[PDB]
Amino acid sequence: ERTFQYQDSLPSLPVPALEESLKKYLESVKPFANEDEYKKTEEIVQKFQEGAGKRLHQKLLERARGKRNWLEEWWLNVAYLDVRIPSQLNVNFVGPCPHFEHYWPAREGTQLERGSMMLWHNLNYWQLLRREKLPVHKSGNTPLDMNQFRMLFSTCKVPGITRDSIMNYFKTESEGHCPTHIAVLCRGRAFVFDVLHEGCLITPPELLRQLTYIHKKCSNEPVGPSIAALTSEERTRWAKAREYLISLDPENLTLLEKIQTSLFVYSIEDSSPHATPEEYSQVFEMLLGGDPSVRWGDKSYNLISFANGIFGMCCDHAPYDAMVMVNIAHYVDERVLETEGRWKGSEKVRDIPLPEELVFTVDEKILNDVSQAKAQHLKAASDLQIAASTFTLHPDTFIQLALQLAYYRLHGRPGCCYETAMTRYFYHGRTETVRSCTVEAVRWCQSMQDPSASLLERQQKMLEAFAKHNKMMKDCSHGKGFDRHLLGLLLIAKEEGLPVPELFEDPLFSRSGGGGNFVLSTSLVGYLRVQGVVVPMVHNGYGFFYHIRDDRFVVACSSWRSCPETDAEKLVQMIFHAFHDMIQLMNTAHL
């Protein structure tokens, strides 16, 4: 069995029935509307269904006839590439490497040695992929799309004036040649080197030589031009700064391309985030913030190394979702566990070419841009608050409802929530929106705060909420959700120069979350001991992510300090209290 053998067999992303999607939409706005607003929306939806919507839907079906995935390109552009805000901080997702839970606890002076093994394991994963030896993900006996794995290595974003682009240079052995070098950033400088020698991959000791070399050289020398810091800027500014950089020297492009084509970017930081199995929220903060001088935010995969021997990953959310990062990080985690975090092979260090430094040609302007880039990222990142804790009826649904209750209790009202649903059953399927703030969820939350509510009433309603969310997650993962569907109708209109349907201008459309207005941006990040996170979707919102282990729930929450109403720490405390009451409710109900 080969990694991508089932791709030509995957079913097309479906287009839900118009009536079904509109019914689900109407039901979803109920929690945020009074009698009058709902009647208005109902009439808007009915007309849409009878006229313009019916026609736009037909055109969407026509699009699906010629594309195995009618949404792919649109989603990439609309959700990511066209967006102009700084993507490095506001869109990229990050995740700590969970090695400090065992063999690699935080400790000074272990950065280079542990780093050599980190590269080695990461690189062996690339070898697996290139040879298509990586196991095919399946749900029972049904194969899942594996395309996102092609975006892990040798992939990088390039800024555009109005639209960015993704460069995917990865290729399997059967497809052709794949770049074989990695890029290292240190003290505002960039270096590169081939990971292969005499046919095989270089070993940790050999990798430790390259890294040690780079570290020593830069340590007692002034910080370099830090061209990398420009990747953390507003997309259009970066696009222009990039063009200017290239004009100063045609060669500068060659350097940019070298970074773009590298298997991945490895970053050396001098900071040391507090990382212990108990508290490690600081790892998330330095991962999203850190020092721009050594990060390449356009890279699909940027492995980060801290001074205290801690590691983390920062990824461009555009080309793929967090599950690929989770899988390689877990693979590495298993390797570390098997080897007790040590290299026990030959200590021989063959004579391999030293790392080559990438020296860009810059003037006074470029340096001012770099200076400006660093400052804006640091200032913006400093407003980020991260709360990470561990807590010790599907678990995901349990957590989603617990969050509904926590937000309801903390803020006094239902929080429109976005939960990621994977659609990998389909060709190049990525995500769909699951709207956790349902009528059922709210009815339950009210009963939990109702003193006159009986124990049986609360359990009964909690179960009805569970049932609703389960059906929701199922339909969405099966391509029967409605959020992407409505986006498709909207895009059909725009693409032909036709007016925006009234349905999208409706106050309830955005109040329920449409248009990227979810006060709770969430997703399960798997069951592989890796955690991920992104900043909130809205200024007065939260980012809430989590992963599940057989004996615990791990969570990561983000909020903006500049928003006095939100507090990541307080919300986490509230959801833990929520888990408790929900457990007790089931136990006492057990009877």
Side-chain angles (χ1 to χ4, degrees), residues 90 383-387 403 407 410-411 413-418 511 513 516-522 533-545 556-572:
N90 305 289
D383 187 48
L384 181 59
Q385 172 181 56
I386 299 295
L403 177 61
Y407 182 96
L410 183 63
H411 296 291
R413 75 181 81 64
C416 55
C417 179
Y418 175 114
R511 185 185 300 171
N517 292 292
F518 294 93
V519 65
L520 290 172
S521 182
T522 80
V533 78
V534 297
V535 306
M537 192 185 292
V538 301
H539 178 66
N540 66 304
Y542 291 98
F544 190 91
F545 308 92
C557 179
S558 59
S559 65
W560 295 116
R561 300 178 179 181
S562 52
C563 181
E565 292 65 56
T566 64
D567 185 304
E569 192 59 59
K570 195 70 180 62
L571 182 59
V572 172

Side-chain angles (χ1 to χ4, degrees), residues 24 38 84 125 136 188 196 273 275 297 364 381-382 397 399 431 438 445 466 497 499 508 513 517 524 548 550 581:
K24 296 182 178 184
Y38 185 75
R84 304 290 84 195
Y125 196 76
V136 172
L196 295 177
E364 177 180 296
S382 65
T397 302
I399 296 174
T431 65
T438 67
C445 286
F466 262 83
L508 286 189
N517 292 292
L524 163 61
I548 306 165
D550 60 303
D581 307 329

Side-chain angles (χ1 to χ4, degrees), residues 477-528:
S477 67
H478 285 56
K480 287 182 173 57
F482 74 85
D483 275 85
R484 299 296 179 275
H485 185 180
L486 297 187
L487 173 61
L489 299 183
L490 175 55
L491 301 186
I492 285 289
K494 289 185 175 300
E495 209 168 68
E496 301 212 318
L498 304 166
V500 175
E502 190 177 309
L503 180 145
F504 305 93
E505 309 180 320
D506 186 340
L508 286 189
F509 186 94
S510 66
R511 185 185 300 171
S512 64
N517 292 292
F518 294 93
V519 65
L520 290 172
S521 182
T522 80
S523 185
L524 163 61
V525 298
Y527 314 77
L528 297 180

Side-chain angles (χ1 to χ4, degrees), residues 151-218:
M151 309 305 152
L152 173 55
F153 300 112
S154 300
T155 301
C156 191
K157 182 193 299 169
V158 172
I161 297 300
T162 56
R163 172 176 290 175
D164 295 356
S165 66
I166 294 299
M167 302 300 283
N168 181 44
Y169 310 103
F170 174 75
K171 287 186 179 62
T172 66
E173 299 189 309
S174 300
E175 306 180 325
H177 177 66
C178 175
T180 63
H181 65 285
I182 62 164
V184 177
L185 306 184
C186 185
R187 297 273 291 172
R189 303 162 69 171
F191 306 74
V192 298
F193 63 88
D194 195 301
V195 300
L196 295 177
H197 182 62
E198 296 189 59
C200 71
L201 177 67
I202 58 177
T203 70
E206 306 187 308
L207 288 163
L208 174 59
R209 194 204 69 170
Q210 310 294 252
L211 296 181
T212 298
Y213 170 77
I214 293 177
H215 190 73
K216 286 288 188 179
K217 167 184 291 300
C218 305

Side-chain angles (χ1 to χ4, degrees), residues 66-338:
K67 296 177 184 293
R68 297 183 62 200
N69 187 313
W70 65 263
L71 174 68
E72 182 165 46
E73 174 173 42
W74 276 341
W75 181 247
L76 182 59
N77 288 165
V78 182
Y80 302 105
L81 304 185
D82 292 344
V83 182
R84 304 290 84 195
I85 67 177
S87 55
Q88 187 170 315
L89 167 67
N90 305 289
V91 187
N92 280 207
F93 56 82
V94 307
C97 298
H99 312 142
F100 56 80
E101 282 192 64
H102 45 274
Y103 297 110
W104 288 352
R107 182 173 52 179
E108 296 297 310
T110 66
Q111 190 174 193
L112 282 54
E113 22 295 311
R114 291 179 181 176
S116 65
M117 292 179 280
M118 278 300 288
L119 291 178
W120 162 260
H121 291 141
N122 269 266
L123 291 172
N124 274 305
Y125 196 76
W126 162 66
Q127 277 200 300
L128 271 56
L129 255 180
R130 188 167 163 62
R131 302 174 188 175
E132 290 190 66
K133 293 289 184 177
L134 182 62
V136 172
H137 292 185
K138 300 176 183 181
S139 180
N141 305 302
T142 295
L144 299 178
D145 185 82
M146 297 295 285
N147 188 246
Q148 293 177 49
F149 279 93
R150 284 175 174 285
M151 309 305 152
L152 173 55
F153 300 112
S154 300
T155 301
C156 191
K157 182 193 299 169
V158 172
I161 297 300
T162 56
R163 172 176 290 175
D164 295 356
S165 66
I166 294 299
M167 302 300 283
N168 181 44
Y169 310 103
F170 174 75
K171 287 186 179 62
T172 66
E173 299 189 309
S174 300
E175 306 180 325
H177 177 66
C178 175
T180 63
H181 65 285
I182 62 164
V184 177
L185 306 184
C186 185
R187 297 273 291 172
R189 303 162 69 171
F191 306 74
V192 298
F193 63 88
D194 195 301
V195 300
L196 295 177
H197 182 62
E198 296 189 59
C200 71
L201 177 67
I202 58 177
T203 70
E206 306 187 308
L207 288 163
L208 174 59
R209 194 204 69 170
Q210 310 294 252
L211 296 181
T212 298
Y213 170 77
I214 293 177
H215 190 73
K216 286 288 188 179
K217 167 184 291 300
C218 305
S219 60
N220 44 31
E221 285 178 45
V223 179
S226 312
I227 292 298
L230 292 181
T231 60
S232 76
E233 267 277 28
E234 189 275 349
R235 308 311 299 169
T236 299
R237 295 186 59 66
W238 172 207
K240 290 174 178 176
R242 182 169 184 283
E243 304 181 308
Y244 181 101
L245 180 63
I246 296 176
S247 63
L248 291 179
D249 195 326
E251 184 175 58
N252 283 322
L253 167 58
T254 310
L255 281 44
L256 291 175
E257 297 185 303
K258 272 179 167 54
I259 297 179
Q260 284 163 36
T261 60
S262 64
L263 290 181
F264 63 86
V265 178
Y266 188 65
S267 301
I268 296 174
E269 290 262 43
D270 292 323
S271 46
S272 298
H274 180 62
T276 68
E278 291 59 65
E279 186 58 56
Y280 57 79
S281 60
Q282 192 168 299
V283 185
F284 285 109
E285 299 177 59
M286 271 181 236
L287 242 33
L288 284 166
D291 197 315
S293 58
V294 295
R295 304 295 187 80
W296 198 270
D298 290 342
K299 202 61 176 166
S300 59
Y301 188 65
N302 191 175
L303 224 203
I304 315 300
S305 169
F306 294 96
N308 53 347
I310 299 296
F311 296 93
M313 307 155 283
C314 182
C315 311
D316 174 18
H317 203 338
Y320 60 0
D321 305 306
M323 292 323 283
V324 171
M325 169 189 83
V326 168
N327 275 260
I328 182 170
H330 173 73
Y331 162 84
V332 174
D333 195 45
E334 291 192 303
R335 298 291 77 65
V336 174
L337 284 166
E338 299 189 316

